[PDB]
């Protein structure tokens, strides 16, 4: 049973879905379950009581949204089962889980219990013929067509940098933080309350993400932007009430570089990139500096790559060619590589079959991934 396999690119922010051997994912929607706050007195209302995908995006105001995954670690397992069921259902894929093999994704250095419980869901509740779990960095390099590359990614949950060299992922050189797009959006919300405009509800939270996506930029020199007085640019809500953002637009993404702003001493994006290259072997460093690949949504800020270059120039050894590459399709880079990996004939050997899972259990899944 070797049908056209499915590529479920997981993530706390957005969940991409579709079939193998495609250019772009057809089914992209945000990873959250929406349930109504209010009472439904009047008949002919929105049925189901559980809202996932474009219905939830359309009807935010009703729904008390709650994210099942935080930092690539599913907290609420019932909510992810409903989302994965919604992905497979007639509203998106229009196919059964029994037909196609599954390509799952996870962030590196995650809890092994979550990986086991993920496999349990796909093998038992859904009846998958074969499952395979993979990393974000390996898939990003598949999409570009390279083998050598440091993959500095920045999603909604996790930021990390896996240094791969000619098809050799070094597991001990991996640097990871739990500071990313969601924490920047949460940090922007806190600033907007200090400015004046308060947002508190979960439906109301996604307005702050939309402000962060649209009107934010990274200053090349933050001390210079502090000393100077900002212009105070405007933004229109779905309501229509105007919001003067002020200095919070440039100070919000500084959480990525200075994680001491949230009050949680970590490395930072630029330090993680340097530390990943430094932890690897001596002869591999110059090739890893030349091949720096970007991916994820929190790399899309204005002047992000310019500042990320300047920080590498400050930290790294002098007179070395730094090249921070970044494709046009950064958001779907991880899905594209999964679709390419799924289309290859070697894919049949790498996966974990249902029969192999029933015999061995979790140990066989831990062996095949690494």
């Amino acid at each position: 049973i070797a049908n056209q396999p499915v590529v479920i690119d997981n993530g706390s922010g957005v969940i991409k879905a579709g079939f193998a051997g495609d250019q772009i994912p057809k089914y992209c929607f945000p990873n959250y379950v929406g349930r109504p706050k209010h009472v439904r007195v009047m008949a002919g209302a929105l049925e189901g009581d559980i809202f996932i995908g474009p219905k939830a995006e359309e009807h935010r105001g009703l729904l008390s949204i709650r994210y099942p995954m935080e930092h690539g670690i599913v907290k609420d397992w019932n909510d992810m089962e409903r989302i994965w069921q919604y992905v497979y259902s007639k509203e998106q894929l229009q196919t059964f889980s029994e037909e196609h093999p599954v390509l799952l994704t996870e962030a590196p250095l995650n809890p092994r219990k979550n990986r086991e419980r993920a496999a349990e869901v796909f093998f038992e509740t859904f009846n998958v013929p074969a499952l395979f779990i993979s990393m974000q960095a390996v898939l990003s390099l598949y999409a570009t067509g390279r083998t050598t590359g440091v993959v500095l990614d920045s999603g909604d949950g996790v930021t990390h940098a896996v240094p791969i060299y000619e098809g050799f992922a070094m597991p001990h050189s991996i640097m990871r933080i739990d500071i990313a797009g969601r924490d920047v959006s949460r940090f922007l919300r806190l600033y907007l309350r200090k400015e004046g405009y308060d947002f508190h509800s979960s439906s109301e939270f996604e307005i702050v993400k939309a402000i962060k996506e649209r009107a934010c930029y990274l200053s090349i020199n933050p001390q210079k932007d502090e000393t100077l007085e900002t212009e105070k640019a405007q933004y229109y809500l779905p309501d229509g009430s105007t919001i003067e953002i002020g200095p919070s637009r440039f100070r919000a993404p500084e959480l990525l570089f200075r994680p001491d702003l949230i009050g949680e001493e970590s490395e930072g994006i630029h330090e993680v990139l340097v530390f990943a290259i430094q932890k690897s072997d001596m002869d591999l460093r110059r090739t890893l500096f030349s091949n720096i690949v970007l991916s994820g949504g929190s790399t899309l800020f204005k002047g992000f790559g310019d500042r990320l270059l300047s920080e590498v120039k400050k930290l790294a050894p002098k007179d070395v060619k730094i090249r921070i590459s970044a494709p046009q399709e950064r958001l779907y880079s991880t899905w594209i590589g999964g679709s390419i990996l799924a289309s290859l004939d070697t894919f049949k050997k790498m996966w974990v079959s249902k029969k192999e899972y029933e015999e061995d259990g979790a140990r066989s899944i831990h062996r095949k991934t690494f």
Binding site: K313, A326, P327
Partner: peptide, 20 residues
Amino acid sequence: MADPKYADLPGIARNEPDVY
């Protein structure tokens, strides 16, 4: 190509100049 989010005029990469 089709889909909601893209960035126009960032470029593929930012590279330092190669010396002799």
